[model samples]
Target: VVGGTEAQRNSWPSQISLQYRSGSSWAHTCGGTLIRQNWVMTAAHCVDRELTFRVVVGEHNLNQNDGTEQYVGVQKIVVHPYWNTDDVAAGYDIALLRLAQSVTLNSYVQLGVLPRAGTILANNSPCYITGWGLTRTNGQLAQTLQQAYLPTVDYAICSSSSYWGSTVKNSMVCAGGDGVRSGCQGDSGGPLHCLVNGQYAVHGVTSFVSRLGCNVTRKPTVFTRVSAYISWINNVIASN
Candidate 1:
């Protein structure tokens, strides 16, 4: 996050740290949202690097020992069939990672609730993006989890000529174009938890940001609209 604050340990229980094995050590790559005991939801772009990936649940700090952490290897990766990296604007930039073992759920680690299919947020809907991503455009990752308020920028306004224009799709959600706080590098594949009916649900999977900078005026953080793929997610889990 560009202007985020250190998140409370239990603030976003479903938040996860996606890492890749680098030599003898592990390096954080992206963030994910645990949707099932043995499944995680993240962006397809996050897994395209061909790295030996691991999912870290209940993690607060990346470099410190947080007793609540649970590390698990990835067993399978299912990227959307129509996922075209060259044309992210065409949508379908989602993926699911099956875990080696079912994780135990608790206060610090739990499944992320998904919104009902066809759910859409109104303009300026309250939402938050949480991750261990960079604190600036080209800065290093945060030592601990961080979060920032990123209100929704409905499709109509986001896709306008002055904004993302043709690059923004209806299958995506736009949020936090405040030019101060927004998703940055390392924040991709993370969850965009939005408040609805007094309950928070995973509404988006962080997908992209402006190439110009992390926080640009009228350039909100773009995400894969989770509700648009609820049925696909279920089918993938059921048939796999």
Candidate 2:
């Protein structure tokens, strides 16, 4: 993430490293949230490529062996039916992955609490975007997880002509358009944890950033509003 600080270990327990096999090693591609013992929520685009993927829980550093890490194979992937690769601006960028096995819960590994269906945060609500994305536009991914305080930029303002404009749909949430701190490449599919009612909940699945740069003025990071797909998420988990 651009202009972010290294996140403390266990600060965001549900955060996960979504990686793909590269040569003999695995490489972090995106971030995801553990929604269930064996289910993960991510962006559909993150799995668009045909490659074997794995989820690493309780991971703080990508290069170091965090003994608390639990690596698991992905058993199945379910991308939202309406998601279209050519048109991310149309929304429906969310996806779910069923893990090969259920992970045990602990201080460093736990399920992320999701916001209620249709829940929308007030303008400028407190939130943070967490990931191991890039430290700047076209930069390398961080070895450790990073987080930035990205305040919510309500739909009305985000959809304005100067902002994301028509690209910002109500099914999406926008945050951190300050042109300084924001989500960048490799951060896609990460969580946008928003504080509500004195507790933090997973409200967004990191979707996209400005094409001009990772952090652009009036182009806040866009996310797939998790609350908008609560039912879909439930149905997928129940049927799968």
Candidate 3:
């Protein structure tokens, strides 16, 4: 993430690295949240390419053997039916990936708590965007996970003409339009952990940044509002 600090190990246990086999080694492509023992919540755009993918849990550093990491193959993927690749602004950018096997929970690996259906954070609510995305626009990925305090920008303001405008929908959540700290490339599909009722919950799936730049003024990072799809997520888990 742009203008972020290295996240402490185990700070966000549910954070994961969504990687794909590149040449002979795996490369981190996006970030995801471990929602269930074998299920991960990510952005549909992350899996748009037809490539073999894997989820690494409890991973802090990409280059070092942290020993807390658990690698698992993806068994199935379910993208939101209404998601259209050509039109990300239309919303519905969320997706779920079922792991081949269930992983054991620990201090460094655990399920992320989801917010209640239809839950919406108040304007400027405390939140953080965590990922291993770029440190700046067109920059290289960080070896360690990074996090930035991205306060929530309510829909009304985010959808204003000077902000994201029509691109910011109610089904989406906008945060950190300060033009300094924000989510960048490789951060997509990560979690936007928002503090609510004295607890942090996964409220957003990192979806997109401004087209002009990763951290642009009046263009806060946009995310798929997880609370808006609670029923859809539950249905997918139950049926599949």
Candidate 4:
């Protein structure tokens, strides 16, 4: 994330690194949230490459060894039917990956609690965006995980002409348009953990940022509203 600070280990247990095999090693591509023992919630754009992907749970640093890490192969990917790469701003950018085997949970690895169906946070609600994305626009990825406080930008204001305009939709959540801290390119599909009712919940899946830059003024990071797809998520889990 742009203008973010290193995240504390185990601060976000459900946070995971979504990687794809390179020529000889795996490279972190995006971030995801562990929702079920074998399921990870991320952005549909993250799986667009169709490369051999894996999920790494309990990972804090990318270039160093961390004792609390579990790697698992991706068995199946379920992208939202309405997702359109050319129209990411139109919403429906969420996806789910089923692991080859269920991962064991612990303090370092656990399922992220989802917000209640149709739940919506008020304007400027407290939230945080965590990932290993770039520290600035057009910059390299961070060696360690990073997180920043990103307050919710309600749909009405985010959709305004000066903000994201028509690109912001009700099916999405916008946060941190302050131009100081925000999700960058590699942060897509990461968790937007919002504090609600005295508890933190995975309320969004990072989707996009402004075309001008990662941390542009009036262009907050946009995310796929997780609460909007609660029923769909349950159906996918049940049928698959």
lDDT of each structure? Answer: 0.89, 0.88, 0.89, 0.87
lDDT of 4 by residue, 63-112 (tens): 77768888899999898898888987677888888999999988888889
Q: How far is candidate 1 from the true structure (C-alpha RMSD, Å)?
A: 0.9
Stretches > 4 Å off in candidate 4: none
Q: How accurate is candidate 1 locally (lDDT)?
A: 0.89
- Model 3, 34-77: lDDT tens digits are 98898999999999899999989999889999699999999898
lDDT value, candidate 4, whole model:
0.87
Pick by lDDT: 1 or 2, better one: 1
Candidate 3 TM-score, true structure as reference? 0.98
lDDT of 2 by residue, 109-192 (tens): 888998889988899999998988889998987888888888988888888888867877889888888878988888888698
lDDT of 1 by residue, 56-172 (tens): 898887788859989899999999999888988899989999999999988888888999999888999999998888899879878988888889898888999999999988899
TM-score of model 4 vs. true structure? 0.97
CA deviation > 4 Å runs, candidate 3 = none
Ranking by lDDT, best first?
1, 3, 2, 4
Worst 10 residues of 2 by lDDT: 161-170
Residue 215, candidate 3: Cα error in Å is 1.3
